[PDB]
Structure formats: structure tokens, C-alpha cells
Ligand SMILES: OC[C@H]1O[C@@H](O[C@H]2[C@H](O)[C@@H](O)[C@@H](O)O[C@@H]2CO)[C@H](O)[C@@H](O)[C@H]1O
Ligand SMILES: OC[C@H]1O[C@@H](O[C@H]2[C@H](O)[C@@H](O)[C@@H](O)O[C@@H]2CO)[C@H](O)[C@@H](O)[C@H]1O
Ligand SMILES: OC[C@H]1O[C@@H](O[C@H]2[C@H](O)[C@@H](O)[C@@H](O)O[C@@H]2CO)[C@H](O)[C@@H](O)[C@H]1O
Ligand SMILES: OC[C@H]1O[C@@H](O[C@H]2[C@H](O)[C@@H](O)[C@H](O)O[C@@H]2CO)[C@H](O)[C@@H](O)[C@H]1O
Ligand SMILES: [Ca+2]
Ligand SMILES: [Ca+2]
Ligand SMILES: [Ca+2]
Ligand SMILES: [Ca+2]
Ligand SMILES: [Mn+2]
Ligand SMILES: [Mn+2]
Ligand SMILES: [Mn+2]
């Protein structure tokens with residue numbers, strides 16, 4: 001089997017294993033801050049630096065993965081706690097969209113909310129333009145921030161959220177388990193064919209954005225990941 | 233919502249939160265040992281004492297849950313490493329089948345592999361009487377040890393194995409991820425309607441068994457669980 | 465060259481290849497539990513029965529060795545997780561000190577912390593009488609529990625810890641590598657002249673101790689060893 | 697803590713984590729073959745694709761690392777079993793030396809035997825130009841194939857060799873334990889200040905070479921690695 005595994009309990013500036021795109025900063029405590037509270041339409045992205053081969057054209061196999069991470073979103077005076085975080089998977093050449101407006105685009109889509117990526121979002125602002133449900137919600141995104149499926153949720157300022165995602169290559173099922181600070185769990189599952197929506201080599205990371213009036217603290221506290229491809 | 237959660241870093245035989253059934257024994261190190269090594273057709277099962285309401289006959293809601301556990305399987309000289317461990321769900325009045333042959337029935341089914349349980353087995357002995365794959369495998373069992381679906385795996389004697397399970401109510405999908413000793417992960421997912429197969433109140437637990445020439449050490453080392461049922 | 469080698473995947477009581485001294489016991493899963501959670505100054509030690517010739521009289525030659533073993537320390541309710549484990553080397557006639565106080569002496573020293581041995585400790589309790597550093601630590605002990613050198617570490621309750629030790633005869637260098645559950649690694653190395661400090665023949669093994677209020681689970685799970693002596 | 701760890705039980709063609717340089721081949725068995733048997737002065741090198749940050753210029757820390765791998769050298773009819781394998785560390789931009797003669801340079805140095813690397817060589821041919829010992833041997837090389845230190849060894853055609861290496865940051869000790877086929881162990885250790893000889897970012901890998909008369913099979917069967925850098 002072909003396996004890729006890593007575990008970050010904290011992050012540091014200058015580790016060749018991570019790629020920073022946009023407004024990302026490394027806090028003195030090892031946390032990663034995704035956006036700049038002082039910039040308009042801020043966008044920050046972090047990616048595992050090595051591309052992962054998620055499917056093989058040779059054999060036809062699709063990797064299975066298990067990953068877990070925890071984050072925290074915190075309110076700041078005078079700005080609308082917006083817009084959220086997104087765990088995403090994109091082609092190896094991935095970059096922040098050319099004239100990114102940030103905001104409800106979450107840093108992975110164009111103005112109309114389209115892009116090339118598969119991801120799980122934690123959205124804290126309702127964009128009628130992207131058909132967002134009326135409350136905070138978790139969503140499964142396939143090439144658009146106009147989620148294929150969403151589930152009501154509640155973002156608590158200063159709360160640490162823990163997340164678990166399992167991607168079962170055979171049923172092509174992607175399942176997510178979110179642990180609220182309060183103990184309750186939130187789950188959402190959806191069949192998504194990675195072999196059909198993405199190249200053989202991809203990048204994994206997190207993205208967050210803000211707007212002019214819409215700004216909040218976005219922190220990535222830990223991330224562990226493992227993928228296994230049944231080789232030839 | 234109605235949430236139930238617990239977590240055992242270690243077990244003990246005087247705790248009112250656990251039911252012991254059969255040859256179960258707790259070791260001084262806090263681990264649970266499910267079979268008796270010099271006992272023919274040994275069978276032992278552990279259950280969380282308190283029954284969990286997984287569905288409502290009032291609303292029609294079904295719970296979502298997240299559970300992870302770690303076990304260890306080790307060989308004993310002059311005995312075939314058999315039969316395996318099963319994480320199961322059953323009616324609150326569940327008992328070791330009357331006149332159980334242990335072995336390939338894993339302590340959950342009758343001689344012809346039937347019973348009332350939903351589970352995930354870690355089977356290390358291929359019983360053709362139950363249509364067993366020809367290698368170690370992980371399987372999804374719905375009221376029978378004749379697995380709805382299996383996946384080839386490898387049981388490594390003396391290694392600590394970690395399991396993560398997610399049940400999404402809305403898609404009714406059960407997905408599993410097993411982190412092996414060599415780092416590799418194994419997954420399996422299947423759609424199971426709990427409402428249709430099980431009663432409102434159930435009990436969760438582990439069961440292991442063996443035969444006359446087929447015995448091995450079956451240890452449960454830790455277990456955490458959280459279920460959430462929406463009451464609206 | 466004269467080579468001695470062994471490998472244990474699990475230990476047994478009826479094994480004349482191993483010397484049991486003190487409170488040691490062998491669990492049904494094949495693990496060695498060095499202390500009695502019930503006794504007050506519990507002391508338990510295990511030694512490979514056969515004496516190893518680590519140096520020659522004829523040629524001032526010292527042997528090189530490579531060894532690896534895994535262990536597990538776990539907390540018990542109402543007792544301070546103390547005192548730690550020690551991999552040691554000593555005279556072939558070695559025995560637990562007379563009227564041993566367990567505790568910070570780790571079952572190898574007298575009350576002032578002196579004895580005849582060379583070892584590597586995994587000290588989880590800070591004894592100022594022995595000038596211990598203020599945190600969990602790994603240490604190099606030369607005839608005293610007042611370490612020649614120490615490095616900060618972290619003992620995780622219920623975690624399997626793996627270690628690898630290399631002793632290089634020309635450099636007279638002793639180095640160790642510890643793999644935490646975390647994936648992180650801790651190392652320590654020190655020049656120790658085995659021929660000036662220990663007799664021609666020795667016995668290798670482990671020891672662990674407890675006190676009145678200070679007690680925890682101390683387990684040895686596996687051990688492989690190889691030593692080679694050039695006789696030219 | 698900043699950690700990098702990976703485990704290759706077998707190799708595969710197209711894995712983004714491995715860089716091939718020269719005559720390298722991936723066999724149907726997962727083994728890597730470093731040289732081409734039909735070519736004059738063949739050279740094959742394999743590298744972990746990600747640059748690893750071994751020392752930090754911010755803090756003055758050096759990382760410690762533990763690695764183990766196994767190889768196999770096997771004779772081929774009518775040719776002199778030459779020249780050997782080398783485990784090396786070089787600047788991240790490392791490449792096979794322009795116009796390399798293969799042979800005793802081991803694919804890492806120039807004609808005079810100089811280069812920019814740190815490594816452990818398994819040298820099977822005695823090159824008087826690089827002051828080789830008269831027999832097969834293990835040597836520690838610092839920027840030259842004219843080893844800083846060597847120890848006699850014996851290469852056994854078709855035997856699987858296992859090697860364990862520990863680099864302790866604080867003492868700056870590189871320790872190697874080689875396990876021959878006949879169970880005998882060979883050890884070699886040397887103080888090497890990595891922070892003085894190499895840039896902050898490096899690459900790890902293996903290199904093998906041959907000449908017109910000197911050719912043999914050179915296989916890499918597995919490789920596990922872990923390095924930890926104290927960041928604080
Ligand atoms: O207020 C948070 C949301 O703002 C929306 O953008 C605003 C911007 O904040 C503002 O100053 C104003 O001029 O109108 C824009 C549209 O309402 C973002 O589109 C949204 O994503 C949130 O961040
Ligand atoms: O607290 C654990 C440490 O105990 C120390 O011994 C104690 C003993 O535990 C206690 O209950 C009391 O009688 O005082 C003694 C002095 O601290 C040990 O010396 C130390 O090794 C730990 O086990
Ligand atoms: O015989 C193995 C060694 O060969 C040396 O190269 C030879 C070459 O093989 C031979 O045909 C003639 O060209 O002379 C050379 C010099 O003796 C290599 O230099 C050496 O490293 C081994 O491969
Ligand atoms: O061999 C392990 C395997 O045994 C099967 O039962 C055996 C039993 O070991 C033996 O005493 C008898 O002679 O034959 C039986 C049929 O092979 C079980 O069926 C199986 O589950 C395993 O435990
Ligand atoms: Ca939104
Ligand atoms: Ca079976
Ligand atoms: Ca101490
Ligand atoms: Ca040479
Ligand atoms: Mn949304
Ligand atoms: Mn089965
Ligand atoms: Mn100490």
C-alpha cells in the first residue's frame with residue numbers, strides 16, 4: 001500500500017511541510033491564524049506541501065483517508081463574525097482565485113461561487129447569493145460554495161471544535177463528525193466521486209476569508225492525516 | 233438534543249456502568265480480556281450498562297453517533313489465532329445465545345450464524361459455513377455473521393489497533409476506519425437502517441470467542457462514545 | 465566474535481531463560497507487570513537468566529550491543545504515578561538492595577541512591593534527594609540514580625513507548641532513542657566506559673518501584689537484544 | 697515539536713514522495729534497484745522528496761533523528777561485485793555530480809572523491825585513491841569518500857542487511873548498528889556537527905554505483921524515518 005501520514009500538534013514558521021497562501025500568520029503559541037484582521041477581503045490558506053496521489057489511472061484505485069483537526073473562531077469588536085473556514089482538496093496547482101473578493105467565497109471560489117475543489121465548510125454568515133441556509137451550518141462543497149448538502153450548526157466564539165472526516169474509497173462516501181464544545185455531535189455524509197472531480201495528485205489544506213465589515217479570528221490548532229492507496 | 237457520552241481509558245470489574253457476560257475478565261492493567269484461554273468454545277461480552285435510545289417512535293428521528301476504541305489480538309502457542317472481536321449493537325435484553333458454540337459465531341449468533349444485532353467484526357479465521365472471505369477481514373454484519381460486506385485486513389499479533397466509527401442518521405451510513413500498526417488505514421462503509429433492524433432502546437458492546445483448537449488473546453483497551461438524538 | 469541474541473514477544477512465568485526478582489508478575493496477555501499495586505514499597509525486577517560477557521580480560525575489548533523494547537506506564541486511581549522504569553546492566557549476582565525502600569531508588573539503589581549498575585531510566589517522579597530535574601525525564605545512570613545526564617520527556621498514561629539503544633565499543637558511546645505515542649522522538653547519548661565500571665560478566669534487565677502514595681502500572685511488552693564481542 | 701516521519705514497507709512507481717535520479721528502477725516486488733547492470737559507470741539515487749529542516753537559524757537547535765532501512769547486495773556472473781551503497785544527507789538541490797565516473801565515488805562525489813554530503817557507506821570494493829581499507833567496510837563520510845572513520849565488515853551476496861541509525865542533537869553523535877545475516881552486529885559512531893556541514897534544509901536518500909568491470913545488484917527493501925526538531 002502507498003500511505004501518507006502526518007501529525008501537527010502545533011505549527012512553526014519555516015517548516016517545509018506547510019505552504020502558506022495569503023494572510024496566514026503563525027502565532028507565538030503554535031496556532032495558525034488564517035486572516036488579517038486589518039485587511040479588507042482578507043484571505044489566508046494553509047496546505048500540506050506534498051501533493052498526495054488520491055487515485056491512479058494505472059490501476060483505477062482511489063485512496064481512502066482519515067483526518068482530524070480542531071479549530072476555533074473568535075469574535076472581535078465592531079465586525080460581523082464572518083465568514084468561516086473550509087477544509088478543502090484541490091488540484092496541485094491550487095492558488096487563491098485571481099481577483100478574490102474573500103467574504104462568502106471562503107477563499108476557494110470565484111465571485112459567482114464556483115471553483116475546482118471538494119471541501120467541508122463551517123459557515124458563519126448567510127449569503128443569499130450562494131443559497132446559504134439561514135443559520136450557521138456545516139456543508140459539503142463540490143466545485144461551488146452553494147453546498148451540495150448542509151446541516152444546521154452553531155459557531156461558539158472562543159469554543160474549540162474537533163472534527164473527524166472519513167473518506168471510504170469503495171462507497172465513495174465522505175463522512176464528517178463535528179464535536180461541539182457542549183458535547184453534542186453533528187454529522188453529515190455525502191457520496192462524492194473524487195476520481196471524477198479531481199486530478200490524480202491533489203493538495204489538502206484549510207482556507208478562511210473575511211470582508212470589509214465581516215471579520216473574526218480564524219485559528220487552526222492541530223491536524224493529523226493518513227491516506228492509503230492500494231498499490232498495484 | 234438528547235446526548236449520551238462516556239469514555240474509558242481503563243476498565244474494572246466493579247463498575248456499575250459495564251455489564252460482563254461469559255468468560256470476560258479485567259486484568260490488573262485495566263484491559264478487558266474477552267476469552268478464557270484454556271476454555272473450550274469460550275465466549276465473553278462487555279456492554280455499556282445503560283441502554284441508549286437510538287430512535288424515537290414518537291418523532292421518527294434516528295441518532296447519529298461517533299465512537300473510537302483500541303484493541304489488541306495476540307497469539308498463544310499451539311492454538312490457531314481465532315476467532316476475532318465484534319463491536320455490536322443489540323436489543324437491551326441481549327444475551328449469549330443459549331448453547332453457543334463460540335468459534336465463528338463470535339458470541340452473537342446461533343450455529344447457523346443468525347441473531348439480532350448490528351455489528352462490525354475483526355475476523356481472523358475463515359469459516360466457509362458463514363461464507364467467510366479467505367483472509368483476515370473487517371465486516372459489516374446485520375443480524376448474521378454472514379457479512380453484508382467485508383474488506384481484507386491483516387491482524388498483527390501483539391499490535392495495538394485503533395478504530396473510528398461514524399453513523400450518519402440522515403444517510404443512515406455506517407463508516408469505519410481502522411489504523412493499523414504499520415500506519416496503513418482500512419475503511420468500509422455500508423447503509424444500515426437502525427430503525428428497521430433494531431428497537432428504540434439498545435445496548436452497545438464487544439464480544440469475542442474461540443473454539444477447542446482455535447484460541448487467542450482478545451483485549452479491549454479503551455472506548456469513547458457519543459450519540460445525539462434530535463428531539464424536534 | 466562471540467554473539468548473544470534473543471527476542472521476546474511475550475514472557476511466561478515458567479521460563480528459566482528469565483530471572484524474576486521481587487513483586488514481578490506475568491499477566492495472561494504475556495506482559496510483565498513489575499510492581500504490585502497493593503504493596504507499599506513495591507519493587508520488581510526481571511533479568512535475562514544468562515550472563516553476557518561484555519568485555520575480555522585477555523584483549524581490552526568491549527562488546528557492542530543493540531537492544532529494543534516497548535513498555536507502558538498507566539495511572540491507577542488515588543495513587544501518584546510513580547516512580548518509573550529502568551533498563552539496567554549489573555553484576556551477575558545482582559539482587560534487590562537489602563531493605564529497599566522502592567520509590568526514587570528504582571529498585572537498583574540503596575537509600576543514598578547508590579548501587580553497582582549502568583542503566584537508562586524513565587523517571588516519572590521528581591526526587592530532590594537524588595537531584596532529579598523537575599519533570600518526567602530519561603537519564604543515564606552510572607552507579608547512582610543521580611544521573612550523569614538527563615533529558616526532559618513526557619510519560620503518557622496508557623501509551624506504548626518504544627526504545628532503541630546502541631552501545632558502540634570504539635567510542636564507548638551509549639545512545640538511546642525513545643518514540644512517544646505522539647510520533648515525536650527524544651534522544652540522549654553519553655560516553656560510559658563499560659569495562660572500568662562493570663565486571664567481565666553481567667546480567668541485563670528491567671526494574672520498577674513504587675512507594676506508599678506513589679504507584680502506577682509498569683509493563684514490559686517485548687524485548688530483543690544482540691551483543692557482539694570481537695575476540696582478536 | 698516539529699516532526700517528520702515516514703514508513704516505506706515497499707516502493708511504488710509514481711509516488712510523489714520519492715524522487716529518482718539516474719539508473720533507478722522499481723521492481724514488481726516493491727524493491728528499488730539502484731543501478732543498471734548493462735551500463736558502464738551506472739549511478740542510481742533515490743531521495744525522500746520533501747526537504748527536511750534539520751537545524752533552525754532562529755533558535756540554534758539541531759534535530760535528532762532515528763532511521764532504519766534494509767538493503768541487499770547480490771553478485772552477478774562475470775563482474776566484480778562493486779561498488780556499494782551510501783545512505784546520505786545533502787543540500788536540497790542535490791544532484792548526481794556532472795560527468796560522474798560511478799565506481800568508488802558512490803554516485804555522490806567527484807573524481808577526487810569530494811562532494812557536499814554526510815553519509816554512511818557500505819563499501820564493497822577497495823579504492824586506493826580514496827584510501828579505502830583493504831576489506832569490505834562501513835565508513836562515515838563527511839564531504840568525501842575518504843572516510844573520517846571506517847570499521848571492517850563483510851558483504852554477503854544475497855543477504856538482507858538491517859541498519860539502525862540515531863543522530864543525537866545535543867552530543868552530535870551519529871550512531872550506526874548493522875545487523876548481518878549470521879546475527880552478528882557491527883557498530884560505528886562519530887561526532888558530526890550537521891549544523892556546520894549542511895544547510896538548514898536537506899534531503900535524505902541512498903545512492904549506489906558501478907563501473908565497467910565492477911557491477912552487482914543493489915536493492916532497497918524498506919525505510920522508516922523520524923526526525924524531531926525542538927521548536928519552542
Ligand atoms: O457583514 C458580513 C458579510 O459582509 C458581506 O460583505 C459586505 C461588507 O461587509 C460591507 O461593508 C457592505 O458594503 O456590504 C457587503 C455586502 O453585504 C460579505 O459578502 C459576507 O460574506 C459577510 O462577510
Ligand atoms: O508521592 C510519590 C513519591 O513518594 C515519595 O515517598 C513518600 C510517600 O509517597 C508518601 O506517601 C509519604 O509517606 O512521604 C514519602 C516522602 O515523599 C517517594 O520518595 C517518591 O519516590 C515517590 O514515590
Ligand atoms: O573492478 C571493480 C572496480 O573497477 C574499477 O574500475 C576499473 C574498470 O572496471 C576496468 O575495466 C578498467 O577500466 O580499470 C578501472 C580501474 O581499475 C573501479 O574504479 C572501482 O571503483 C570498482 O568498480
Ligand atoms: O481451528 C480454528 C477454528 O476451529 C474451528 O473449529 C474446529 C476445531 O478447532 C477442532 O477442535 C475441530 O476438530 O474442528 C473444528 C472445525 O474445523 C471453528 O469452526 C473456527 O471458528 C475456528 O475457531
Ligand atoms: Ca456563507
Ligand atoms: Ca470467521
Ligand atoms: Ca525520580
Ligand atoms: Ca570503495
Ligand atoms: Mn454555506
Ligand atoms: Mn467474517
Ligand atoms: Mn532521575
Ligand SMILES: [Mn+2]
Pocket residue numbers: 817819828829833835841843
Ligand atoms: Mn570506502
